[PDB]
Amino acid sequence: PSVFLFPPKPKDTLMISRTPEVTCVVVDVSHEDPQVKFNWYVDGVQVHNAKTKPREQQYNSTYRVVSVLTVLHQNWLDGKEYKCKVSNKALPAPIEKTISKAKGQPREPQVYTLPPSREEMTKNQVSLTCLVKGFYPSDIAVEWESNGQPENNYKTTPPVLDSDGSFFLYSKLTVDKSRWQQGNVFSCSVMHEALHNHYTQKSLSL
Amino acid sequence: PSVFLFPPKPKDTLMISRTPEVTCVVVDVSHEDPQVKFNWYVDGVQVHNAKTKPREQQYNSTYRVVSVLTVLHQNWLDGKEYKCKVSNKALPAPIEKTISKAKGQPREPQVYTLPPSREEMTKNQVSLTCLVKGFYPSDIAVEWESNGQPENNYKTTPPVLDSDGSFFLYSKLTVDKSRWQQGNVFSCSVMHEALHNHYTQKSLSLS
Numbered sequence: 172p173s174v175f176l177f178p179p180k181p182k183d184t185l186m187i188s189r190t191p192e193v194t195c196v197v198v199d200v201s202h203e204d205p206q207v208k209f210n211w212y213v214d215g216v217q218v219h220n221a222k223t224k225p226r227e228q229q230y231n232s233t234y235r236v237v238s239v240l241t242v243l244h245q246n247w248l249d250g251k252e253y254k255c256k257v258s259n260k261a262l263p264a265p266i267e268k269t270i271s272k273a274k275g276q277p278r279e280p281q282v283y284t285l286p287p288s289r290e291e292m293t294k295n296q297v298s299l300t301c302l303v304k305g306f307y308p309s310d311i312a313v314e315w316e317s318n319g320q321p322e323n324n325y326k327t328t329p330p331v332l333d334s335d336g337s338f339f340l341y342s343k344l345t346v347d348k349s350r351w352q353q354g355n356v357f358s359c360s361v362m363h364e365a366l367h368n369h370y371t372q373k374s375l376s377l
Numbered sequence: 378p379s380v381f382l383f384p385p386k387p388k389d390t391l392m393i394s395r396t397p398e399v400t401c402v403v404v405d406v407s408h409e410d411p412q413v414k415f416n417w418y419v420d421g422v423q424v425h426n427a428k429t430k431p432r433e434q435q436y437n438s439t440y441r442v443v444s445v446l447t448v449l450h451q452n453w454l455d456g457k458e459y460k461c462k463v464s465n466k467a468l469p470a471p472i473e474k475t476i477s478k479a480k481g482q483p484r485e486p487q488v489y490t491l492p493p494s495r496e497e498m499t500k501n502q503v504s505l506t507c508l509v510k511g512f513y514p515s516d517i518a519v520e521w522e523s524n525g526q527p528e529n530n531y532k533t534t535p536p537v538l539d540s541d542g543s544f545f546l547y548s549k550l551t552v553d554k555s556r557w558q559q560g561n562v563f564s565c566s567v568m569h570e571a572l573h574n575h576y577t578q579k580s581l582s583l584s
């Protein structure tokens with residue numbers, strides 16, 4: 172019988188337009204007593220329910236009850252400590268787990284655009300590169316767009332811990348060498364808290 | 378009592394010169410029954426010992442026995458399944474764990490060198506990029522060098538699963554803009570099974 176707390180997507184917390192949420196996943200809940208009682212304390216407060224919501228889920232022969240808590244963007248951003256107290260009669264002591272964003276002065280992520288190297292132009296598809304470096308915390312999202320429209324064929328490394336104490340990563344957009352050669356312009360959208368409006372956009376084009 | 382199987386370093390299995398090996402680490406071995414019996418099966422066979430070797434070690438109040446088995450570069454490379462059967466009296470059923478090279482046809486990596494972006498030359502240190510793409514399995518190693526000399530100020534993202542089913546990654550070398558501008562030449566070395574001699578080199582330089 173175990174509890175697992177998860178923080179919200181970096182993106183979810185950096186855009187007021189969307190709803191961030193912290194989940195309290197509970198594993199190995201036997202059938203001989205599946206009733207699980209959740210409790211959420213935001214920075215020590217709120218024994219009394221607020222905005223929570225869980226639901227059932229059957230698995231390997233065990234259970235996975237999941238309670239969700241809707242967070243306030245600034246709350247999370249201002250390092251509030253979220254706690255989830257899980258209770259089960261199959262447990263002597265309730266399970267308490269806390270979660271808050273990483274601690275430490277935030278750092279503006281430098282964003283760059285790297286075009287397909289010469290040697291790669293001998294293929295039918297080329298890779299556009301966006302180097303996102305020097306940012307802290309690790310919370311971050313990256314996207315690509317051409318003429319104001321999304322792009323699907325791309326992938327982004329998870330963040331990597333650099334030398335100073337900042338992180339970095341690369342997002343690779345792959346598109347037919349023609350499009351790139353047809354002069355089209357693409358753009359890497361980066362969303363980080365330490366950024367102005369939590370969003371900066373960098374363009375790429377031959 | 379728990380067993381943990383560890384594969385060899387990617388380098389170890391790509392250079393005949395080196396000795397790769399698979400480790401079978403056991404933890405939570407009590408004092409009232411420290412007796413630990415290992416068994417190694419290479420693709421199902423060899424219950425009867427061969428080339429293994431373990432030894433004792435005391436920890437927080439439990440034990441940590443560790444058996445090591447030396448593999449043959451080819452076997453590993455050829456996806457042989459290495460099994461470690463750990464046995465202990467304080468255990469109902471022995472513990473069986475297997476480990477081997479990832480299943481799927483190998484893929485030759487593409488090494489591309491990316492110079493520092495214009496916008497990045499407004500700094501004291503620049504980033505040289507090495508994009509290693511379309512490789513499989515993910516086992517791999519990347520390093521950097523200037524005039525035949527190593528380089529330490531670099532970092533390499535863990536492999537990433539691509540759309541095809543291939544992997545990719547980037548390795549970033551950080552060098553003072555001067556060196557970059559003094560015309561200096563660097564090279565990222567990529568070692569992979571599906572390469573020729575298991576190693577290709579790509580150079581980077583401004584001009």
Ligand SMILES: *[C@@H]1O[C@H](CO[C@H]2O[C@@H](C)[C@@H](O)[C@@H](O)[C@@H]2O)[C@@H](O[C@@H]2O[C@H](CO)[C@@H](O[C@@H]3O[C@H](CO[C@H]4O[C@H](CO)[C@@H](O)[C@H](O)[C@@H]4O[C@@H]4O[C@H](CO)[C@@H](O[C@@H]5O[C@H](CO)[C@H](O)[C@H](O)[C@H]5O)[C@H](O)[C@H]4NC(C)=O)[C@@H](O)[C@H](O[C@H]4O[C@H](CO)[C@@H](O)[C@H](O)[C@@H]4O)[C@@H]3O)[C@H](O)[C@H]2NC(C)=O)[C@H](O)[C@H]1NC(C)=O
Binds near residue numbers: 381385389396400
């Ligand atoms: C009592 O103490 C026990 C151990 O004591 C240690 O605790 C410290 C805090 C100190 O107090 C000190 O006494 C000791 O350091 C403790 O046991 C722990 O039990 C854990 C589980 O309960 C177990 O966790 C697993 O760890 C795996 C990773 O292990 C590697 O990494 C750690 C550190 O990151 C390292 O310490 C280990 O030795 C392992 O490191 C690797 O070791 C192999 C073999 O030596 C190396 O193999 C290379 O092979 C090549 C062949 O070509 C070459 O030969 C090369 O030279 C070799 O090195 C390898 O290089 C090396 N890598 C590193 C780290 O550099 C996780 O992988 C594992 O995660 C899996 O499993 C979990 C579930 O269990 C899943 O959730 C995961 O998804 C995943 O599948 C898991 O986390 C600890 O390893 C173990 N402690 C250690 C450090 O050994 C015990 O719990 C305590 N008593 C109690 C309360 O139970």
Ligand SMILES: *[C@H]1O[C@H](CO[C@H]2O[C@@H](C)[C@@H](O)[C@@H](O)[C@@H]2O)[C@@H](O[C@@H]2O[C@H](CO)[C@@H](O[C@@H]3O[C@H](CO[C@@H]4O[C@H](CO)[C@@H](O)[C@H](O)[C@@H]4O[C@@H]4O[C@H](CO)[C@@H](O[C@@H]5O[C@H](CO)[C@H](O)[C@H](O)[C@H]5O)[C@H](O)[C@H]4NC(C)=O)[C@@H](O)[C@H](O[C@H]4O[C@H](CO)[C@@H](O)[C@H](O)[C@@H]4O)[C@@H]3O)[C@H](O)[C@H]2NC(C)=O)[C@H](O)[C@H]1NC(C)=O
Binds near residue numbers: 173183199233
């Ligand atoms: C049978 O029941 C389950 C079965 O599990 C699976 O395998 C088999 C058994 C199969 O039959 C099937 O049931 C399942 O496929 C077993 O329970 C497992 O127990 C282990 C340990 O007890 C748990 O391990 C932990 O895993 C977390 C990682 O989190 C999970 O990742 C996996 C895959 O990566 C995923 O399947 C899970 O659902 C979790 O993923 C995360 O889930 C949260 C919850 O929604 C998401 O939250 C996001 O929140 C944002 C907020 O804004 C938004 O809401 C998003 O929408 C929302 O997604 C996350 O996004 C999501 N992650 C991803 C990838 O997106 C580890 O972190 C954790 O590690 C820690 O503990 C280790 C020790 O155990 C330790 O060594 C580590 O150092 C670390 O401290 C831990 O490993 C399993 O999660 C769990 N299985 C699952 C999936 O629930 C059970 O054991 C079996 N029976 C038995 C034998 O009891």
